[PDB]
Protein backbone atom coordinates (compact mmCIF):
# COMPACT_ATOMS: atom_id res chain seq x y z
CA UNK A 1 0.00 0.00 0.00
CA UNK A 2 2.96 2.28 0.68
CA UNK A 3 4.85 4.44 -1.80
CA UNK A 4 7.84 3.21 -3.71
CA UNK A 5 10.50 5.65 -2.42
CA UNK A 6 12.08 7.81 -5.12
CA UNK A 7 15.83 8.10 -4.61
CA UNK A 8 18.38 10.20 -6.47
CA UNK A 9 20.03 8.16 -9.19
CA UNK A 10 16.97 5.99 -9.82
CA UNK A 11 15.91 5.42 -13.43
CA UNK A 12 12.18 5.66 -14.18
CA UNK A 13 10.02 5.37 -17.25
CA UNK A 14 8.39 8.78 -17.69
CA UNK A 15 5.99 10.49 -20.09
CA UNK A 16 7.79 13.62 -21.30
CA UNK A 17 5.22 14.33 -24.04
CA UNK A 18 4.58 16.75 -25.52
CA UNK A 19 7.77 18.67 -26.41
CA UNK A 20 8.90 21.29 -28.92
CA UNK A 21 11.94 21.55 -31.17
CA UNK A 22 15.09 19.80 -29.95
CA UNK A 23 13.63 18.87 -26.55
CA UNK A 24 13.62 15.17 -25.71
CA UNK A 25 10.08 13.81 -25.73
CA UNK A 26 8.01 10.64 -25.74
CA UNK A 27 7.93 7.92 -23.11
CA UNK A 28 11.53 7.16 -22.21
CA UNK A 29 13.79 6.34 -19.25
CA UNK A 30 14.92 9.26 -17.10
CA UNK A 31 17.34 9.46 -14.17
CA UNK A 32 16.30 11.27 -10.99
CA UNK A 33 18.78 14.03 -10.17
CA UNK A 34 16.88 15.98 -7.49
CA UNK A 35 18.02 15.69 -3.87
CA UNK A 36 16.43 12.94 -1.78
CA UNK A 37 14.48 15.30 0.49
CA UNK A 38 12.84 16.94 -2.50
CA UNK A 39 12.16 13.48 -3.90
CA UNK A 40 10.46 12.36 -0.68
CA UNK A 41 8.02 15.23 -0.14
CA UNK A 42 7.76 17.49 -3.20
CA UNK A 43 5.05 17.04 -5.86
CA UNK A 44 7.79 17.20 -8.53
CA UNK A 45 11.08 15.51 -9.36
CA UNK A 46 14.00 16.68 -11.50
CA UNK A 47 15.15 14.22 -14.16
CA UNK A 48 17.65 13.98 -16.99
CA UNK A 49 16.55 12.36 -20.25
CA UNK A 50 18.15 9.16 -21.53
CA UNK A 51 18.38 8.61 -25.29
CA UNK A 52 19.33 5.57 -27.34
CA UNK A 53 19.53 7.49 -30.63
CA UNK A 54 23.25 8.03 -29.88
CA UNK A 55 25.95 5.67 -28.64
CA UNK A 56 29.08 7.59 -27.58
CA UNK A 57 29.40 10.35 -24.98
CA UNK A 58 31.03 12.87 -27.39
CA UNK A 59 30.51 15.97 -25.20
CA UNK A 60 31.27 16.35 -21.46
CA UNK A 61 27.58 16.82 -20.53
CA UNK A 62 26.78 13.30 -21.77
CA UNK A 63 27.21 10.09 -19.76
CA UNK A 64 27.06 6.61 -21.30
CA UNK A 65 25.16 3.73 -19.69
CA UNK A 66 25.51 0.04 -20.50
CA UNK A 67 22.47 -1.81 -21.83
CA UNK A 68 23.05 -5.02 -19.87
CA UNK A 69 23.89 -3.66 -16.41
CA UNK A 70 20.99 -1.17 -16.44
CA UNK A 71 18.50 -3.31 -18.41
CA UNK A 72 17.65 -0.94 -21.27
CA UNK A 73 16.79 -1.55 -24.92
CA UNK A 74 20.29 -0.56 -26.06
CA UNK A 75 23.46 1.24 -25.06
CA UNK A 76 22.22 4.73 -24.22
CA UNK A 77 23.48 8.14 -23.15
CA UNK A 78 22.31 10.27 -20.23
CA UNK A 79 21.78 13.83 -21.51
CA UNK A 80 22.62 16.21 -18.67
CA UNK A 81 21.73 19.15 -20.92
CA UNK A 82 18.20 17.69 -21.29
CA UNK A 83 16.73 18.30 -17.82
CA UNK A 84 13.17 18.91 -16.71
CA UNK A 85 11.05 19.13 -13.58
CA UNK A 86 8.28 16.53 -13.77
CA UNK A 87 5.15 16.26 -11.68
CA UNK A 88 5.31 12.79 -10.13
CA UNK A 89 2.13 11.90 -12.05
CA UNK A 90 4.38 11.47 -15.11
CA UNK A 91 6.34 8.60 -13.51
CA UNK A 92 5.21 5.20 -14.79
CA UNK A 93 7.60 2.60 -13.35
CA UNK A 94 11.06 2.22 -11.85
CA UNK A 95 13.50 0.53 -14.23
CA UNK A 96 16.76 0.43 -12.25
CA UNK A 97 19.27 2.71 -10.51
CA UNK A 98 22.75 4.00 -11.29
CA UNK A 99 25.89 2.86 -9.51
CA UNK A 100 27.98 5.17 -7.33
CA UNK A 101 30.61 5.61 -10.05
CA UNK A 102 28.00 6.30 -12.72
CA UNK A 103 26.26 8.90 -10.56
CA UNK A 104 29.58 10.67 -9.96
CA UNK A 105 29.77 11.04 -13.75
CA UNK A 106 26.24 12.47 -13.71
CA UNK A 107 27.30 14.88 -10.95
CA UNK A 108 30.33 16.12 -12.90
CA UNK A 109 28.25 16.47 -16.06
CA UNK A 110 25.68 18.58 -14.21
CA UNK A 111 28.39 20.90 -12.87
CA UNK A 112 29.55 21.56 -16.44
CA UNK A 113 26.04 21.65 -17.91
CA UNK A 114 24.90 24.29 -15.41
CA UNK A 115 28.20 26.20 -15.21
CA UNK A 116 28.64 25.39 -11.52
CA UNK A 117 32.35 24.52 -11.52
CA UNK A 118 34.27 27.21 -9.65
CA UNK A 119 36.76 28.21 -12.33
CA UNK A 120 39.26 30.46 -10.51
CA UNK B 1 20.16 41.78 -37.90
CA UNK B 2 22.16 39.52 -35.61
CA UNK B 3 20.72 37.88 -32.50
CA UNK B 4 21.83 39.22 -29.14
CA UNK B 5 23.71 36.48 -27.25
CA UNK B 6 22.16 34.41 -24.47
CA UNK B 7 24.14 34.49 -21.22
CA UNK B 8 23.86 32.54 -17.98
CA UNK B 9 22.00 34.72 -15.49
CA UNK B 10 19.84 36.45 -18.09
CA UNK B 11 16.09 36.65 -17.49
CA UNK B 12 13.98 35.87 -20.56
CA UNK B 13 10.27 35.76 -21.17
CA UNK B 14 9.66 32.18 -22.28
CA UNK B 15 6.72 29.98 -23.30
CA UNK B 16 6.72 26.92 -21.03
CA UNK B 17 3.25 25.71 -22.06
CA UNK B 18 1.89 23.11 -22.01
CA UNK B 19 2.57 21.48 -18.62
CA UNK B 20 0.96 19.01 -16.23
CA UNK B 21 0.32 19.00 -12.50
CA UNK B 22 2.57 21.13 -10.30
CA UNK B 23 4.95 22.04 -13.14
CA UNK B 24 5.31 25.74 -13.87
CA UNK B 25 3.59 26.70 -17.11
CA UNK B 26 2.31 29.56 -19.23
CA UNK B 27 4.45 32.39 -20.57
CA UNK B 28 6.61 33.64 -17.71
CA UNK B 29 10.08 35.01 -16.95
CA UNK B 30 12.81 32.38 -16.56
CA UNK B 31 16.48 32.48 -15.56
CA UNK B 32 19.14 31.08 -17.89
CA UNK B 33 21.22 28.61 -15.87
CA UNK B 34 23.01 26.64 -18.60
CA UNK B 35 26.71 27.33 -19.17
CA UNK B 36 27.50 29.99 -21.74
CA UNK B 37 29.14 27.61 -24.23
CA UNK B 38 25.83 25.80 -24.52
CA UNK B 39 23.95 29.10 -24.59
CA UNK B 40 25.98 30.26 -27.60
CA UNK B 41 25.94 27.13 -29.79
CA UNK B 42 23.30 24.67 -28.59
CA UNK B 43 19.70 24.58 -29.89
CA UNK B 44 18.48 24.41 -26.27
CA UNK B 45 18.93 26.39 -23.06
CA UNK B 46 18.37 25.30 -19.47
CA UNK B 47 16.19 27.63 -17.41
CA UNK B 48 14.72 28.01 -13.93
CA UNK B 49 11.19 29.35 -13.59
CA UNK B 50 10.22 32.54 -11.76
CA UNK B 51 6.89 32.62 -9.93
CA UNK B 52 4.76 35.40 -8.48
CA UNK B 53 2.50 33.17 -6.40
CA UNK B 54 5.01 33.62 -3.55
CA UNK B 55 7.30 36.54 -2.75
CA UNK B 56 9.41 34.98 0.03
CA UNK B 57 11.66 31.93 -0.17
CA UNK B 58 9.80 28.89 1.14
CA UNK B 59 12.86 26.59 1.03
CA UNK B 60 16.63 26.94 0.36
CA UNK B 61 16.04 26.17 -3.34
CA UNK B 62 14.10 29.44 -3.65
CA UNK B 63 15.73 32.81 -4.37
CA UNK B 64 13.84 36.09 -4.01
CA UNK B 65 14.09 38.91 -6.56
CA UNK B 66 12.60 42.37 -6.11
CA UNK B 67 10.38 43.72 -8.88
CA UNK B 68 11.94 47.19 -9.07
CA UNK B 69 15.56 46.19 -9.74
CA UNK B 70 14.66 43.37 -12.14
CA UNK B 71 11.65 44.95 -13.92
CA UNK B 72 9.07 42.43 -12.71
CA UNK B 73 5.33 42.84 -12.25
CA UNK B 74 5.75 42.08 -8.53
CA UNK B 75 8.19 40.66 -6.01
CA UNK B 76 8.81 37.12 -7.21
CA UNK B 77 10.80 33.96 -6.44
CA UNK B 78 13.21 31.95 -8.56
CA UNK B 79 12.38 28.25 -8.19
CA UNK B 80 15.55 26.18 -8.51
CA UNK B 81 13.44 23.03 -8.12
CA UNK B 82 11.52 24.01 -11.30
CA UNK B 83 14.18 23.75 -14.01
CA UNK B 84 13.78 22.60 -17.60
CA UNK B 85 15.58 22.42 -20.92
CA UNK B 86 13.90 24.55 -23.58
CA UNK B 87 14.40 24.83 -27.30
CA UNK B 88 15.41 28.42 -28.01
CA UNK B 89 12.23 28.85 -30.09
CA UNK B 90 10.44 29.22 -26.73
CA UNK B 91 12.49 32.31 -25.78
CA UNK B 92 10.34 35.40 -26.38
CA UNK B 93 12.40 38.40 -25.19
CA UNK B 94 15.18 39.27 -22.75
CA UNK B 95 13.79 41.07 -19.70
CA UNK B 96 16.94 41.68 -17.62
CA UNK B 97 19.83 39.87 -15.96
CA UNK B 98 20.74 39.03 -12.38
CA UNK B 99 23.51 40.66 -10.37
CA UNK B 100 26.64 38.72 -9.46
CA UNK B 101 25.41 38.45 -5.86
CA UNK B 102 22.01 37.16 -6.97
CA UNK B 103 23.57 34.56 -9.27
CA UNK B 104 25.68 33.39 -6.32
CA UNK B 105 22.42 32.59 -4.52
CA UNK B 106 21.12 30.88 -7.67
CA UNK B 107 24.28 28.77 -7.82
CA UNK B 108 23.95 27.75 -4.16
CA UNK B 109 20.24 26.93 -4.51
CA UNK B 110 20.93 24.84 -7.61
CA UNK B 111 23.60 22.89 -5.71
CA UNK B 112 21.05 21.94 -3.04
CA UNK B 113 18.28 21.26 -5.57
CA UNK B 114 20.38 18.76 -7.54
CA UNK B 115 22.21 17.34 -4.51
CA UNK B 116 25.64 18.50 -5.67
CA UNK B 117 27.15 19.80 -2.42
CA UNK B 118 30.07 18.16 -0.61
CA UNK B 119 30.03 15.66 2.25
Amino acid at each position, epitope marked *: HSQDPIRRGDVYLADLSPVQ*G*SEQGGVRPVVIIQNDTGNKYSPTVIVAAITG*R*INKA*K*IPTHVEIEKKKYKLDKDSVILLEQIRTLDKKRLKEKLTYLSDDKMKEVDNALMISLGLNAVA | *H*S*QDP*IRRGDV*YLADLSPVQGSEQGGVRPVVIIQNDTGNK*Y*S*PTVIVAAITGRINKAKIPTHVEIEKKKYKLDKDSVILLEQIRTL*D*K*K*R*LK*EKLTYLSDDKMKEVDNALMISLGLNAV
Partner: nanobody
Amino acid sequence: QVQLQESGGGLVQPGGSLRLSCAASGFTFSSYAMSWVRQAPGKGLEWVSDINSGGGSTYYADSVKGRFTISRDNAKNTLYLQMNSLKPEDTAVYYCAAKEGPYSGSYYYMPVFRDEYDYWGQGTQVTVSS
Protein backbone atom coordinates in the same frame (compact mmCIF):
# COMPACT_ATOMS: atom_id res chain seq x y z
CA GLN C 1 -0.32 27.80 -47.58
CA VAL C 2 3.08 27.31 -45.94
CA GLN C 3 5.64 26.21 -48.52
CA LEU C 4 9.42 26.01 -48.75
CA GLN C 5 10.59 25.22 -52.28
CA GLU C 6 14.24 24.37 -52.91
CA SER C 7 16.02 24.76 -56.23
CA GLY C 8 19.54 24.93 -57.60
CA GLY C 9 20.66 21.35 -57.04
CA GLY C 10 22.36 19.44 -59.81
CA LEU C 11 25.28 17.32 -60.94
CA VAL C 12 28.79 18.73 -60.55
CA GLN C 13 32.27 17.27 -60.74
CA PRO C 14 34.37 17.12 -57.57
CA GLY C 15 35.70 20.60 -56.89
CA GLY C 16 32.73 22.32 -58.53
CA SER C 17 30.28 24.72 -56.94
CA LEU C 18 26.53 25.21 -56.61
CA ARG C 19 24.12 27.83 -55.25
CA LEU C 20 21.04 26.36 -53.58
CA SER C 21 17.99 28.51 -52.89
CA CYS C 22 14.81 28.00 -50.87
CA ALA C 23 11.82 30.30 -51.41
CA ALA C 24 9.29 30.76 -48.60
CA SER C 25 5.64 31.79 -48.55
CA GLY C 26 2.54 31.37 -46.41
CA PHE C 27 4.34 32.35 -43.20
CA THR C 28 6.44 35.22 -41.85
CA PHE C 29 9.90 34.30 -43.14
CA SER C 30 11.58 37.03 -41.07
CA SER C 31 10.31 35.48 -37.81
CA TYR C 32 12.03 32.12 -38.35
CA ALA C 33 15.58 30.85 -38.15
CA MET C 34 16.48 28.82 -41.23
CA SER C 35 18.42 25.57 -41.50
CA TRP C 36 19.94 23.43 -44.21
CA VAL C 37 19.98 19.70 -43.49
CA ARG C 38 21.00 17.01 -45.96
CA GLN C 39 20.35 13.28 -46.28
CA ALA C 40 22.51 10.75 -48.10
CA PRO C 41 21.01 7.44 -49.33
CA GLY C 42 20.30 5.11 -46.43
CA LYS C 43 21.58 7.69 -43.92
CA GLY C 44 19.97 9.80 -41.24
CA LEU C 45 19.47 13.54 -41.41
CA GLU C 46 22.67 15.59 -41.14
CA TRP C 47 22.38 19.23 -40.10
CA VAL C 48 24.53 21.42 -42.36
CA SER C 49 24.10 25.10 -41.54
CA ASP C 50 21.93 27.54 -39.60
CA ILE C 51 21.11 31.24 -39.89
CA ASN C 52 19.10 33.33 -37.45
CA SER C 53 15.86 35.08 -38.36
CA GLY C 54 17.66 38.38 -38.98
CA GLY C 55 20.58 36.93 -40.94
CA GLY C 56 23.42 38.19 -38.74
CA SER C 57 24.34 34.88 -37.08
CA THR C 58 25.46 31.75 -38.94
CA TYR C 59 26.49 28.26 -37.87
CA TYR C 60 28.10 25.36 -39.73
CA ALA C 61 28.82 21.69 -39.24
CA ASP C 62 32.51 20.83 -39.05
CA SER C 63 32.22 18.82 -42.28
CA VAL C 64 31.16 21.85 -44.36
CA LYS C 65 32.57 24.84 -42.45
CA GLY C 66 34.65 27.04 -44.75
CA ARG C 67 33.34 25.31 -47.89
CA PHE C 68 29.66 26.30 -47.59
CA THR C 69 28.16 29.73 -46.90
CA ILE C 70 24.58 30.28 -45.73
CA SER C 71 22.79 33.59 -46.26
CA ARG C 72 19.29 35.01 -46.50
CA ASP C 73 17.41 37.89 -48.11
CA ASN C 74 14.30 38.57 -46.04
CA ALA C 75 13.06 41.00 -48.71
CA LYS C 76 12.92 38.22 -51.31
CA ASN C 77 11.94 35.72 -48.58
CA THR C 78 14.73 33.44 -49.78
CA LEU C 79 17.42 31.33 -48.11
CA TYR C 80 20.67 30.50 -49.92
CA LEU C 81 23.45 27.94 -49.55
CA GLN C 82 26.63 28.69 -51.49
CA MET C 83 28.54 25.42 -51.88
CA ASN C 84 32.20 25.44 -52.92
CA SER C 85 34.95 22.80 -52.91
CA LEU C 86 32.33 20.09 -53.38
CA LYS C 87 33.35 16.47 -52.83
CA PRO C 88 31.52 13.15 -53.41
CA GLU C 89 30.62 12.96 -49.71
CA ASP C 90 28.41 16.02 -50.25
CA THR C 91 26.10 14.00 -52.52
CA ALA C 92 22.68 14.11 -50.83
CA VAL C 93 19.27 15.73 -50.98
CA TYR C 94 19.37 19.14 -49.28
CA TYR C 95 16.39 20.47 -47.32
CA CYS C 96 15.75 23.89 -45.90
CA ALA C 97 13.89 23.92 -42.59
CA ALA C 98 12.45 26.67 -40.40
CA LYS C 99 12.15 27.15 -36.64
CA GLU C 100 10.35 30.17 -35.20
CA GLY C 101 11.88 32.52 -32.67
CA PRO C 102 14.31 35.43 -32.55
CA TYR C 103 16.83 33.39 -30.53
CA SER C 104 16.69 30.26 -32.68
CA GLY C 105 19.58 29.43 -34.97
CA SER C 106 22.43 27.39 -33.53
CA TYR C 107 24.92 24.54 -33.92
CA TYR C 108 23.32 21.08 -33.96
CA TYR C 109 25.44 18.24 -32.56
CA MET C 110 22.79 15.50 -32.27
CA PRO C 111 21.08 13.57 -35.05
CA VAL C 112 18.21 15.78 -36.17
CA PHE C 113 14.66 14.67 -36.92
CA ARG C 114 11.80 16.16 -38.90
CA ASP C 115 9.69 17.00 -35.84
CA GLU C 116 12.52 19.13 -34.40
CA TYR C 117 11.68 21.86 -36.94
CA ASP C 118 8.54 23.84 -37.72
CA TYR C 119 8.51 23.82 -41.54
CA TRP C 120 10.31 21.59 -44.05
CA GLY C 121 11.09 22.04 -47.72
CA GLN C 122 10.72 19.42 -50.42
CA GLY C 123 14.47 19.06 -51.01
CA THR C 124 16.84 19.54 -53.91
CA GLN C 125 19.24 16.84 -55.11
CA VAL C 126 23.00 17.42 -55.15
CA THR C 127 25.32 14.86 -56.75
CA VAL C 128 29.11 15.20 -56.86
CA SER C 129 30.82 12.65 -59.10
CA SER C 130 33.23 12.70 -62.03
